[PDB]
Amino acid sequence: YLSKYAIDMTEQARQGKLDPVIGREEEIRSTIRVLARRIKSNPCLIGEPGIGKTAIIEGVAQRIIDDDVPTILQGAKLFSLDLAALTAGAKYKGDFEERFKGVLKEIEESKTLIVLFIDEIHMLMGNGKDDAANILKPALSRGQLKVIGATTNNEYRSIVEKDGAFERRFQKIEVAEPSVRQTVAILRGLQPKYEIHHGVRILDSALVTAAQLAKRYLPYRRLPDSALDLVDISCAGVAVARDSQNVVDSDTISETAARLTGIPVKKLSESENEKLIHMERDLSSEVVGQMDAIKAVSNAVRLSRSGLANPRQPASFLFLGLSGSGKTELAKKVAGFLFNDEDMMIRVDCSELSEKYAVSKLLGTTAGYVGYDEGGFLTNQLQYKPYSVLLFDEVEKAHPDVLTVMLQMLDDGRITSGQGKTIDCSNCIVIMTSNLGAEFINSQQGSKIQESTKNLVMGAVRQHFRPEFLNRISSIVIFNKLSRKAIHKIVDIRLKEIEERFEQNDKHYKLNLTQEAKDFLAKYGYSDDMGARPLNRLIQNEILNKLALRILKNEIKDKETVNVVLEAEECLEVLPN
Amino acid sequence: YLSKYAIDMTEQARQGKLDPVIGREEEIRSTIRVLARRIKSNPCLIGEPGIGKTAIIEGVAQRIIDDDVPTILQGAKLFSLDLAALTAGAKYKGDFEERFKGVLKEIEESKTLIVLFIDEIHMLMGNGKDDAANILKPALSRGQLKVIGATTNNEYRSIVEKDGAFERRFQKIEVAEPSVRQTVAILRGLQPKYEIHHGVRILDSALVTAAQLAKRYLPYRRLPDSALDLVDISCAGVAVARDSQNVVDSDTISETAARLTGIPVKKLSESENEKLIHMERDLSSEVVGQMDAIKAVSNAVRLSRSGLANPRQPASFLFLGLSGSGKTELAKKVAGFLFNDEDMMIRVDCSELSEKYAVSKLLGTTAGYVGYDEGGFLTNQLQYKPYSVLLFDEVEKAHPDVLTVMLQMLDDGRITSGQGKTIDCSNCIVIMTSNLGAEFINSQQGSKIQESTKNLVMGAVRQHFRPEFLNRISSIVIFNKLSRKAIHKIVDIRLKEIEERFEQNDKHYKLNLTQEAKDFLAKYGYSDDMGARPLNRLIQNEILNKLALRILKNEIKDKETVNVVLEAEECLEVLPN
Amino acid sequence: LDPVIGREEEIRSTIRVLARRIKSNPCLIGEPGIGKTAIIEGVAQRIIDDDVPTILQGAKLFSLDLAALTAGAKYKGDFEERFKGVLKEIEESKTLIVLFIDEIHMLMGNGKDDAANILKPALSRGQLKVIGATTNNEYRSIVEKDGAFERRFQKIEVAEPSVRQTVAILRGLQPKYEIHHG
Lengths: 577, 577, 182
Ligand SMILES: Nc1ncnc2c1ncn2[C@@H]1O[C@H](COP(=O)(O)OP(=O)(O)O)[C@@H](O)[C@H]1O
Ligand SMILES: Nc1ncnc2c1ncn2[C@@H]1O[C@H](COP(=O)(O)OP(=O)(O)O)[C@@H](O)[C@H]1O
Ligand SMILES: Nc1ncnc2c1ncn2[C@@H]1O[C@H](COP(=O)(O)OP(=O)(O)O)[C@@H](O)[C@H]1O
Ligand SMILES: Nc1ncnc2c1ncn2[C@@H]1O[C@H](COP(=O)(O)OP(=O)(O)O)[C@@H](O)[C@H]1O
Ligand SMILES: Nc1ncnc2c1ncn2[C@@H]1O[C@H](COP(=O)(O)OP(=O)(O)O)[C@@H](O)[C@H]1O
Fold this sequence. Notes:
- This is part of a larger assembly, with three copies of chain A.
- By secondary structure, chain A is an alpha/beta fold.
- Chain A has helices spanning 2-5, 9-15, 25-36, 53-65, 95-108, 136-139, 153-163, 180-198, 204-217, 223-243, 249-261, 273-286, 291-304, 327-339, 379-384, 400-410, 438-441, 453-464, 467-470, 483-502, 516-525, 533-551, and strands at 7-8, 42-47, 76-80, 113-117, 146-152, 170-174, 201-202, 246-247, 316-321, 346-349, 390-393, 430-434, 475-479.
- The first copy, chain A, contains 22 helices and 13 strands.
- A six-stranded mixed beta sheet of chain A has the order 1-3-4-5-2-6.
- The radius of gyration of chain A is 30 Å and the shape is elongated.
- The termini of chain A are far apart.
- Chains A and B meet through helix 3, helix 6, helix 12 and helix 13 of A and helix 5, helix 9, helix 11 and helix 26 of B.
- One adenosine-5'-diphosphate is lined by residues 19-23, 47, 49-55, 152, 186, 189-190, 224-225, 228 of chain A.
């Protein structure tokens, strides 16, 4: 049976057919110690996709091969007993179980200390069990039959919670994601594999770059793999050039990575330094007024960079102030400059986050219960989007259960769902917004809220939220009244970003509204409660729909001249034909 | 034939090939006495998994083969049967019954007084009767078919209380963890099993401390078995190393174990003694001022130690005073010293209460309570952290019924649950906190608050809480205003902490603030309404904001001279990079 | 739909206010049983006749009430959901929709309780136009309890027609009675 249903990895490994494993020496040492145990001799690797599971198993073979194992294990050998033997080559219920018994008996015979391994224990047990190895295997545990289990933590948890027995037969070994630098070392170990595979030379800077990029381009997959994937892709691109050479940091790899989604200048040019020294000036141009809010945000974001602030915590803010103040524009513009995607952010509508708090909760419905979008609202999105702003809209209405989770992620951001998996997105800036202190911004005590008044704003916060929450937010930020002092030019800022996307620039407007329509829109648009929100609405109707009404006359060649044709707003701005 | 899927334990015992069992002589005698009974003669050990429930049964087998068994039972043999017997061979509805009935009949039919046993009794009755090999037995109890086996107290209640008939068929026998010395004797008994299996010699003292370590280290694990985990794992450690001699006193064990939580040396040190002696002296370096509070703690701790306090319970304090005075800081720092880990603290929100509190406190329950984490907030943390500090946040806000619930910590360390399980605290020091007397501390009568102020505080305490509650407290401790003298050191603590917690050693700072920058920090970071708390935020706002940004701007490559320069707080940092 | 007359001033005010781009939501403040409905029917015809400021040229009138909060409701919070559902549908593109509420007494929620009422200040200055109506006996209490209502709505003083106005109405509706009854 073994010749059909299992692979003698140790012997293959002895011959070659192995990738030298590095950065997992402790996992191997742990595995060896477990296998050596008089009792409870079975280890299990628990990690995530891209972590190094198969390598850990091969690393064990390397120690076996060199007999760099305790006396007990010097006769040990590894066999891959999974997937193909279970379902890919199977047709009916029981095919696996009978084959399994078959190999266990071949294995049980004393053909050296056979140590088996499972690449995916989810394939065993699964759903309904039916003794899919799970009862027979431990039933025969006296006959050596040592085995190394393995799984993602997500499944480990689900499998364990359904069972709880193998959990106490198998020693847990958690396998951590390696540092980017460790990832690079892995890439270096595999450098010649890629060079041979593709026939291209790889520069050391290329390896460094790929690992760094992996952190920055494949947010849902762990670093060894994410980096190795890009390197193989990049090398293949170079091989194509070779076939019609070498692998280089930005010339091949960065662009290859960029080309997986777009990107062409981002990540490559993103040295961060000048965004702070000059990148901050951009938010204050995209968002107008509230310069200190911008600075506060910029500062804290930057503090999370380089782990200067303890890296366990992402920047985190509480945005208090007027609606229509730009508090979310800032969140988006930050995502824009910081990540190059204003819509990468995840919006959390907290006004709906009442007693339901299930699929509607970041953590999701406790796994296994009806309503199986288990973290579909936010966790799953975060797996794909850990490099963006998470924002809580009217967080003051969020159910305490949600607020609790926020606290859990607010610091020590090991974001973990009810699925049993961790996202750990310490790079996700989180913004909570609130109208809680609005009663004090409404005091009008400076368009820029002055001392005491801002303290009353913070006061309201102290009264509503638990101190622990408040003690972990990196800053409370106030979205100061925009006033004429801002909107007199915001209107231009808005009209300009519209121009730039108005007709994809095939045709464009001048729209010189002088002072007259600029003030018309600003004065009738801007609200001291709703801020610029109604202003934007006026632009859509006063200008964009109006311009459309004129273009439908089919009389334009290009540009757009202005003549503001003079109850509230009876003028309607009106630009001339 | 019953042998098809089950084991003759007595015969195994006749052949040896089974660890000898010691330290449970009374349990097995009790078991035997029960078995010898005319009526209601079945036993069932009750405890925790890993407790030795099997070993106790095995000890009985030894008694049979040694004829220490009464003559009515000398004609008996023990036979195990479970899980594989139940499910490996069960494919269709009714297979359970057929497999059991088959066995039961073979036994019933003259062939030896076999005492059948189930080590996982809750499997009988499945998840809710429907004769999941359940009714079957009472019906067959008329054939004697004597049964032993075991249950945890949790599953016991979960199943047995529902079964009812069990209670009139079995005479349950409770079991419990042995002492450490007894465990060591067990370890000595098993010592050669490892010395032979691993080849690793075990120092006598190694066995001794392994058991000690099991309690000092392996939170929720059973002393029985866990102590062996330490022995076997430690031996495996040595075995791997020697082939790449022995297990030494505490050294190899402790490093092998301690590494699982860290704190290596702290665990590998003096058995409290010196820590207890220089508790306050050393604590004063992390907790500044409040010497009396520190002394109070040191004393209670010392009393919880060495059995000086009544061993039936944990020590506790009521920490009264202003937030920011260090009530929690102290509690965390002592969690630090006590458990070598400040994160051990269990934080409890006392204000989140109503008369419907239930799962909200410990594991209390109501109809509809089910949801798995039915109050693990307090109890699972204690389960997982039995060597810890638990703290009540503004205990004055606790509902009186909850203050009563807290009685389970205040005395009588036994802790109940509506899940049918207990926690039973011991080395779980509890701190209750409150601002109940804040208006008296605000008298500011010295940096060492005068007694009449304290009397006002104690008055309020007595007025507010039931005397019964208060009486159980080891000490009620009142915190002083910290003032300049305390923050004079607190700042330095935090400054050092920040670089030490700066990932590793990435920049190093001189932190040479001199009195002036320390005063700056005090001026804008210490407040009588938040005490020293704002110092943290201020340091973030000044030191991290200004220096981190310069680092991030690549202005600060390495090192850093640190101070301030003379609206407000323009003085923040103002340093060359 | 019956013709309405004697309300041209009340209707014109309603139209001017709806046309108004800031405090654009009118409310028929006054004596109950005076044809407040008729004013709305008036508006419903002003649109179509389009004898309105061109602001309302793209507009449409609907009467959103009762079914809106109760008939389509099953449990707590449905007032917000049913209203929100509609508001989303009409927030953009599909004409300059104006809703009429028979009673503003259904606004300010069931003791506010975010019962559609939350959508009110949210939409009060978010297009989503609405015409209210009220009995003065409580109107005064609506504005004292709400505050925002007075700040967000334009009261229109409305009252019963004189006898002469009434007979004009009756004559206008004369054929409606004659036709129905024969
Ligand atoms: N030489 C090596 N050093 C470290 N890791 C390696 C090495 N060679 C292969 N690997 C990794 O083992 C991993 C495959 O296991 P893993 O992704 O963790 O499995 P799964 O998807 O099932 O969780 C890949 O990332 C693979 O590149
Ligand atoms: N420079 C700017 N450009 C465009 N909008 C700005 C700018 N500064 C502030 N704002 C305004 O902030 C408004 C959005 O405010 P916000 O409260 O976050 O949104 P919402 O009210 O839609 O929830 C936008 O309409 C935007 O015009
Ligand atoms: N000499 C001994 N004396 C007491 N207990 C022993 C001895 N030898 C082995 N054991 C016990 O074997 C037990 C295993 O625990 P047990 O509760 O029976 O669970 P399991 O079903 O996992 O074996 C341990 O408690 C261990 O102490
Ligand atoms: N004596 C002290 N030594 C060091 N830090 C202190 C001391 N007293 C107060 N603090 C500060 O106050 C904070 C905790 O305050 P505390 O009163 O114990 O709790 P809380 O204010 O969070 O209710 C700590 O972060 C700590 O920096
Ligand atoms: N001239 C009119 N002809 C017909 N109806 C009129 C006239 N003037 C006012 N009305 C009516 O006043 C009515 C108010 O409706 P009604 O059903 O009586 O409820 P309410 O008790 O709120 O007033 C409207 O239907 C409106 O048409």
